[PDB]
From a paper:
Inositol 1,3,4,5,6-pentakisphosphate 2-kinase (IP5 2-K)3 is a key enzyme of higher inositol phosphate (inositide, IP) metabolism. IP5 2-K is present in yeast to mammals and catalyzes the synthesis of phytic acid (inositol hexakisphosphate or IP6) from IP5 and ATP. Mouse IP5 2-K folds in two lobes, N- and C-terminal lobes, connected by a hinge, thereby conserving the general fold scheme of PKs and IPKs, and in a similar way, both lobes coordinate the nucleotide between them. The CIP lobe represents more than half of the protein and is specific to IP5 2-K enzymes.
We have solved the structure of Mus musculus IP5 2-K (mIP5 2-K) at 2.4 Å resolution from a truncated form lacking the 21 C-terminal residues (ΔC-mIP5 2-K). In addition, we present two different crystal forms, including one or two molecules in the asymmetric unit, respectively, the first showing much better resolution (2.4 versus 3.2 Å). Unexpectedly, the formation of the ternary complex (mIP5 2-K + IP5 + ATP) was achieved by protein incubation with IP6 and ADP. The triphosphate moiety is tightly bound to the N-lobe of the enzyme through polar interactions and to the C-lobe through two magnesium ions. Regarding the inositide substrate, IP5 is tightly bound to the enzyme through its five phosphates. Residues Lys-138 and Asp-400 make direct interaction with Pγ and/or the nucleophile 2-OH. The distance between the 2-OH and Pγ oxygen is 3.2 Å suggesting an in-line transference mechanism probably in agreement with an associative mechanism. Pγ is oriented through a magnesium ion (Mg1) coordinated to Asp-437 and to Asp-439 in a second sphere. Asp-437 also coordinates a second magnesium ion (Mg2) together with Ser-402 through a water molecule. The Zn1 site is formed by residues from two CIP lobe elements: Cys-159, Cys-162, and Cys-181 from CIP-I and Cys-291 from CIP-II.
Residue numbers in the entry: 5 to 40, 43 to 121, 129 to 220, 229 to 243, 249 to 295, 311 to 410, 420 to 464
Write the structure that this text describes.
């Protein structure tokens, strides 16, 4: 049975909220809505996240790297009881959207920050690892600077964050250890929503560098005096070594997309290992072959069709089920347009999957002891992907509108 005080606030984006259970190693992921959906709509929506996880993302990213635990039902009093308790924990910016309190459904997943031994967990939101290559783009700046580094200017000017991050995803997504070190230092300096650190299921950093060292010193140095620089450097190196870790150097990927350059970004102040999670993530991100500029015309062709034929929306699995036939249709990587709805639709569904891979999080576990990297302790490590719900069909015009603004505003600033 469910107890209000046994669950604690863990985190949120702007689609969902997560609460971790103090005893068992599980979390519950709840949806979020404004004060202004049906119970059935939520059930399918939540079940679509599991189907998409099982039937699409386990193929692209691997069975062991993905965990999308089943949908679960709860009593409506418990959800209310929990909601009010936690309201103070939530940061004030997220509080526009309220918690899913009326449905009584949520998604139960394993807590990737918890599992007598201690545990250190680093969560990263790496963002898009390539600079767009497509001839459909009408701004030449998009071929030079990454989305992330461009986007940074508008976010700081808007007052989202205090200053521009030096993190460029192409530094992290390169194979080069020196570039990967610089990227991780840059995330440590200016965390934003791209870095978080947990110790025994407790957040300890990215919503002070010397305060981090207090917490991390027991791990890497379980007596010699070790300064902050020493502690933070070994965190950077171990993590770099976990991101360069691959268990599948030989096998052929489901997506064999080629990295069309450039591999260095201008805004940033011999490639990834074949089986590593960062490589595999980058491959599913590259399903965006056309760019939004690009893809948006093909969105209109599909919309035009669906407005003519409303019944076919369910028929063509636009909002699921995200099943084996859905997966199979993503494998047509041909970029030659034949003016057909089928072509446009294929590219639209591929673009949504790429959007999902561009906004996903990577959770790295570390525990002192299977799979082990070199360190001044002896650490057993695990890797996971988080935040793999398919991005909606309806947001594609928003991506087109936003992309224009990011590039134009950057082009003004430079
Ligand atoms: O606006 P984008 O493209 O940078 O990405 C959004 C993210 O913005 P960010 O740049 O990471 O601050 C945004 O993150 P924040 O809530 O702004 O931290 C979300 O991840 C959003 O995804 P969803 O629609 O909530 O599932 C993301 O929305 P999508 O565009 O992926 O739908
Ligand atoms: N299984 C899990 N184990 C541990 N922490 C988790 C788990 N799932 C989610 N979290 C935490 O909860 C946070 C919010 O969840 P999540 O990012 O998946 O939702 P979201 O609303 O889709 O966010 P986003 O804005 O990034 O799209 C994560 O950033 C992470 O810190
Ligand atoms: Mg997230
Ligand atoms: Mg999301
Ligand atoms: Zn960059």
């Amino acid at each position: 049975k469910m107890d209000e005080n046994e669950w604690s606030y863990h985190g949120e984006g702007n689609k969902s909220l997560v609460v971790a259970h103090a005893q068992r190693c599980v979390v519950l992921r709840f949806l979020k809505f404004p004060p202004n959906k049906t119970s059935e709509e939520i059930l399918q929506h939540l079940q679509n996240i599991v189907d998409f996880g099982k039937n699409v993302m386990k193929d692209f990213l691997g069975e062991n790297y993905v965990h999308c635990g089943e949908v679960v039902q709860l009593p409506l009093e418990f959800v209310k009881q929990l909601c009010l308790k936690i309201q103070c924990e939530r940061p004030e910016s997220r509080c526009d959207k309220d918690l899913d309190t009326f449905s009584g459904y949520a998604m139960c997943l394993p807590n990737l920050t918890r599992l007598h031994r201690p545990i250190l967990c680093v969560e990263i939101k790496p963002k898009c690892g390539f600079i767009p290559f497509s001839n459909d783009v009408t701004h030449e700046m998009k071929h030079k600077v990454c989305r992330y580094c461009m986007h940074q200017h508008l976010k700081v000017a808007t007052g989202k964050w205090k200053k521009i991050s030096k993190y460029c995803p192409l530094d992290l997504y390169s194979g080069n250890k020196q570039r990967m070190h610089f990227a991780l230092r840059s995330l440590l300096q200016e965390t934003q929503n791209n870095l978080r650190i947990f110790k025994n299921g407790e957040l300890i950093y990215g919503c002070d560098l010397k305060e981090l060292a207090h917490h991390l010193k027991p791990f890497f140095f379980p007596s010699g005096p070790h300064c902050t620089k020493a502690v933070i450097r070994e965190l950077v190196h171990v993590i770099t070594r976990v991101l360069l870790s691959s268990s599948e150097k030989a096998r052929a990927g489901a997506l064999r997309l080629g990295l069309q350059g450039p591999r260095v970004c201008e805004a940033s102040p011999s490639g990834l290992p074949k089986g590593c999670l960062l490589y595999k993530t980058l491959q599913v991100q590259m399903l965006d072959q056309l760019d939004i500029e690009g893809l948006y015309p093909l969105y209109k062709r599909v919309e035009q069709y669906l407005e003519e034929f409303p019944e076919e929306r369910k028929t063509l699995q636009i909002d699921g089920p995200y099943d084996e036939v859905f997966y199979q249709k993503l494998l047509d990587l041909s970029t030659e347009d034949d003016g057909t709805v089928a072509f446009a639709l294929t590219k639209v569904q591929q673009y949504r999957v790429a959007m999902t891979a561009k906004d996903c999080s990577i959770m790295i576990a570390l525990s002192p002891c299977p799979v082990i990297p070199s360190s001044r302790s002896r650490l057993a490590f695990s890797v996971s992907v988080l935040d793999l719900d398919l991005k909606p069909y309806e947001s594609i015009p928003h991506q087109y509108k936003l992309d224009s603004k990011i590039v134009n505003y950057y082009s003004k600033t430079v």
